[PDB]
Amino acid sequence: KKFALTAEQRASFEKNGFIGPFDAYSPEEMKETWKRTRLRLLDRSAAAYQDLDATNIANYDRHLDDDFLASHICRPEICDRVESILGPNVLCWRTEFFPKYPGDEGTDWHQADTFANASGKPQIIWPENEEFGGTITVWTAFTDANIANGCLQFIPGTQNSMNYDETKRMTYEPDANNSVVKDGVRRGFFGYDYRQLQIDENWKPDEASAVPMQMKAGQFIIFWSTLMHASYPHSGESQEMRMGFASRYVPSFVHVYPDSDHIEEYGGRISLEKYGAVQVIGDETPEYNRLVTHTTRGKKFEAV
Numbered sequence: 001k002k003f004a005l006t007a008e009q010r011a012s013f014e015k016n017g018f019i020g021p022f023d024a025y026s027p028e029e030m031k032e033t034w035k036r037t038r039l040r041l042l043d044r045s046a047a048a049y050q051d052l053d054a055t056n057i058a059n060y061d062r063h064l065d066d067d068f069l070a071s072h073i074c075r076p077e078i079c080d081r082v083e084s085i086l087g088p089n090v091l092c093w094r095t096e097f098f099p100k101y102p103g104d105e106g107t108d109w110h111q112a113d114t115f116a117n118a119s120g121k122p123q124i125i126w127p128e129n130e131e132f133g134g135t136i137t138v139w140t141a142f143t144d145a146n147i148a149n150g151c152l153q154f155i156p157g158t159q160n161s162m163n164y165d166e167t168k169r170m171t172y173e174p175d176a177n178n179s180v181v182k183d184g185v186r187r188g189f190f191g192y193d194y195r196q197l198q199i200d201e202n203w204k205p206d207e208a209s210a211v212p213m214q215m216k217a218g219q220f221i222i223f224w225s226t227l228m229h230a231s232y233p234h235s236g237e238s239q240e241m242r243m244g245f246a247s248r249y250v251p252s253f254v255h256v257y258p259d260s261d262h263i264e265e266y267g268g269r270i271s272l273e274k275y276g277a278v279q280v281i282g283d284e285t286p287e288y289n290r291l292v293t294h295t296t297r298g299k300k301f302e303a304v
């Protein structure tokens with residue numbers, strides 16, 4: 001395909017667990033798009049999740065209602081590269097906005113395989129006979145992302161061994177988890193402390209090996225959710241907020257929300273009644289995954 005990963009890019013992705021950044025839009029197109037989208041998103045009247053019983057879940061799955069986001073998750077610049085990794089049939093199962101307002105704590109070091117981390121119940125399940133896990137995250141910079149405003153950071157090559165156990169639980173306590181200093185950096189996990197999920201209580205992330213991923217508005221980075229990743233704090237030197245938009249992809253054989261019609265996490269609870277995965281690549285998905293083809297405003301999931 002036109003935007004497939006090169007053989008060299010594919011080898012680097014296999015080694016590092018991330019690849020990019022790549023361009024989806026020019027910075028100028030992204031700036032104007034985000035200006036409009038940010039306003040539009042304040043209107044939740046068509047959102048898949050009406051009652052939030054509150055929560056970070058408010059940031060979830062706005063592609064299910066929003067015209068632009070519906071196109072974005074299907075961009076060939078993104079999908080051709082995800083296809084290079086995940087094969088001929090792929091679903092977008094989750095999107096999430098990640099704001100860092102001026103002064104916000106950095107995101108905790110974490111890895112996620114099943115996405116039971118917060119809820120205690122797996123959200124994606126790969127074939128049990130195999131050794132694969134996690135989801136391909138595409139994180140798009142809707143604003144510029146630099147160290148001072150809380151860009152992502154990665155510890156390269158850590159995607160093949162989990163340091164966290166998502167069957168352990170972590171307590172939701174926003175009150176307590178506000179800019180807690182961890183190894184000299186203010187960090188948290190949206191009201192949780194991801195250190196609670198460590199397999200070994202005394203183990204620490206190899207933060208000395210962390211690398212920054214600075215990006216311009218309109219770029220995206222592709223990484224395994226099983227990769228050690230985090231963000232710097234937003235120092236507030238800039239009075240502009242940072243916004244990332246994560247779209248999460250799995251091959252269509254992965255079980256999405258097995259045995260669930262609701263999820264409860266991040267201080268909220270939502271019904272999956274209007275949820276579906278979106279088939280962004282290919283046209284075969286097993287019956288056990290509920291799909292949607294259009295947004296709640298009847299916009300088809302296709303790149304425009």
Ligand SMILES: CCCCCCCCCC(=O)OC[C@H]1O[C@@](CO)(O[C@H]2O[C@@H](OC)[C@@H](O)[C@H](O)[C@@H]2O)[C@@H](O)[C@@H]1O
Nearest residue numbers: 085086087088131132133134135159160161224226251
């Ligand atoms: C027709 C084409 C179909 C293609 C389907 C997509 C298959 C993706 C396979 C993969 O690379 O999975 C890698 C994920 O599994 C992980 C989980 O730790 O790796 C495991 O897979 C192996 O890759 C062969 C090993 O290298 C690692 O030890 C690892 O445990 C991480 O690299 C990722 O989260």
Ligand SMILES: O=C(O)CCC(=O)C(=O)O
Nearest residue numbers: 098107137139231244246
């Ligand atoms: O943007 C952030 O601070 C965290 C992003 C993240 O953890 C993810 O995309 O999985």
Ligand SMILES: [Cl-]
Nearest residue numbers: 155205206228
């Ligand atoms: Cl590490």
Ligand SMILES: [Cl-]
Nearest residue numbers: 110111112225
């Ligand atoms: Cl994650």
Ligand SMILES: [Fe+2]
Nearest residue numbers: 110112225229
């Ligand atoms: Fe993450």
